[PDB]
Design a protein around this ligand. Structure first.
Ligand code: TTZ
Length: 507
């Protein structure tokens, strides 16, 4: 599958640059009505002719992409009822569609996100599992396994323009989730695809020397092996074409290709975009994702290694189980050395430019707790950092910096709420965990009471309003919000007396 900027070459660039559609993703999802080679030749003939109209040419040659709860419907009921609305089934696609086929139905986030997304799906699957839709969980794992075998990795989503990258790696955790229902059979079944995904993340370690980086692998000067986010292309994102061109244009002191690589790699991080990656929080054109070793990614790699060990052991391959534990142990040592800021007292990303742990506290700092990599003293310090700096009245803040980007204050994102809660639980920090859950759930409920929907991210400074920021508007649905809300709704009420709306009083 060739991404649309390649498939449709100059025409793609021209349509995007013309801003015919208010979202650059719209034309990225256009389906050619005939062979792109024919369309391009026709366009070449017409484009310089007197009276040529690009919009009419597009309308001819492409097909462009195409609810309110009943009175008193509870939050839980609304969520359960929305799953089919968010479910898509594309076993086959029309020719030249940027949508990539998947063997089973899948849940998409909502709104402009009309394809499956990698890390969203984990948190969506937690909700599907909580509500007994294990068939759909199994379908999703199967879909991702298929993507691993077909492409060698899980793309950011099932679009041609996402093949160049992945997203935060949750597939091993998806397999572990499935094994909560199916037992170790699930780990053993999908061991081949977990190993294949690990091969993707680690591709480049062979022949890598200390102080070098290759693709998603970094080897520090002392030999420590860690991963980073990394897209295989260094061109504007087809789905955000004009944005990326404008971002690069705005900073002539950097090569455009480096800015494009870093924009794409921030998309791969899931955190498109954030002060977390930026020298200057007020200028996206200073982002330097590929020079930053992320604490979340490396926590997820540790978990992947641990799960690979567990699956290998279950399968009866002891040499591979031992090897993976050895790898995990090395990873954990790397996290504790290079991804802990001892001056500030929190986990943090590592800076390959300055060769120093970064100073900024972000919600990614809870990931070492979430995966049980953290020392207990450091987990307790993280509980304190969370209470002091990140816990707000409406949930866990993503960062403390209001940059105008969406992965930043004052926005709270469902997945980060859950990672934090679960990480804190893993170290017995139940009070802070419950406050995050209650505060965020109150936000979700309040917003639902007012707007009759769940949304992509929330303003945690108060309750009852969705968040904003970045290059597109707040989206509605919303897969991981719905999934995390269900999980948290179960944590907060007895279950001998389960709640269908978030109560005003803690049981
Ligand atoms: O506006 C274009 C971008 O849209 C997506 N970006 C984001 N979408 C939501 C956030 S940020 C991400 O972490 C999740 O996957 C998301 O909830 C759904 O896609 C996509 O993942 C990125 O790869 C795209 O470049």
């Amino acid at each position: 599958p060739q991404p649309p900027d390649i498939l449709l070459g100059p025409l793609f660039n021209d349509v995007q640059n013309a801003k015919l559609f208010p979202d650059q993703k719209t034309f990225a999802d256009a389906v050619p009505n005939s062979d792109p080679l024919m369309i391009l030749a026709d366009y070449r003939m017409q484009q310089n002719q007197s009276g040529f109209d690009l919009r009419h040419f597009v309308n001819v040659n492409f097909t462009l992409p195409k609810y309110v709860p009943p009175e008193g419907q509870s939050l839980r009921e609304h969520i359960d009822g929305l799953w089919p609305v968010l479910t898509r089934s594309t076993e086959n696609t029309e020719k030249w569609d940027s949508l990539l086929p998947l063997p089973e139905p899948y849940v998409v986030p909502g709104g402009r996100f009309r394809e499956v997304y990698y890390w969203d799906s984990y948190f969506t699957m937690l909700g599907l599992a909580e509500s007994g839709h294990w068939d759909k969980v199994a379908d999703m794992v199967a879909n991702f396994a298929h993507e691993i075998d077909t492409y060698g990795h899980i793309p950011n989503g099932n679009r041609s323009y996402y093949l160049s990258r992945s997203q935060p790696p949750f597939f091993a955790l998806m397999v572990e989730l499935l094994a909560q229902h199916e037992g170790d059979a699930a780990l053993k079944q999908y061991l081949p695809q977990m190993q294949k995904e690990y091969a993707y993340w680690m591709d480049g370690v062979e022949n890598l020397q200390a102080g070098q980086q290759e693709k998603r692998v970094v080897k520090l000067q002392d030999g420590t092996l860690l991963n980073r986010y990394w897209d295989d292309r260094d061109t504007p994102r087809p789905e955000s074409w004009v944005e990326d061109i404008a971002t690069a244009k705005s900073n002539p002191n950097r090569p455009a290709t480096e800015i494009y690589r870093d924009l794409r790699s921030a998309a791969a991080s899931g955190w498109d975009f954030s002060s977390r990656w930026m020298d200057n929080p007020q200028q996206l054109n200073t982002l330097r994702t590929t020079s930053i070793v992320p604490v979340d990614l490396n926590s997820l790699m540790f978990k992947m290694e641990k799960i690979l060990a567990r699956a290998s052991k279950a399968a009866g391959d002891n040499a591979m189980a031992n090897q993976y534990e050895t790898l995990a142990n090395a990873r954990q040592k790397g996290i504790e050395k290079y991804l802990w800021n001892d001056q500030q007292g929190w986990y943090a990303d590592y800076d390959l430019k300055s060769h120093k742990v970064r100073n900024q506290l972000t919600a990614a700092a809870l990931f070492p707790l979430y995966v049980n990599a953290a020392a207990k003293d450091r987990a307790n310090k993280m509980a304190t950092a969370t209470k002091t700096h990140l816990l707000q009245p409406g949930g866990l803040n993503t960062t403390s910096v209001k940059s105008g980007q969406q992965w930043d204050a004052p926005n709270g994102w469902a997945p980060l709420q859950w990672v934090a809660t679960e990480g804190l639980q893993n170290y017995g920090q139940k009070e802070v965990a419950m406050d995050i859950s209650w505060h965020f759930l109150t936000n979700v409920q309040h917003t639902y009471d007012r707007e009759k929907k769940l949304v992509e991210k929330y303003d945690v400074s108060t309750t009852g309003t969705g968040g904003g920021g970045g290059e597109y508007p707040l989206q509605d649905g919303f897969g991981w919000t719905n999934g995390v809300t269900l999980k948290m709704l179960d944590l907060i009420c007895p279950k001998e007396q389960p709640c269908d709306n978030v109560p005003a009083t803690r049981p």
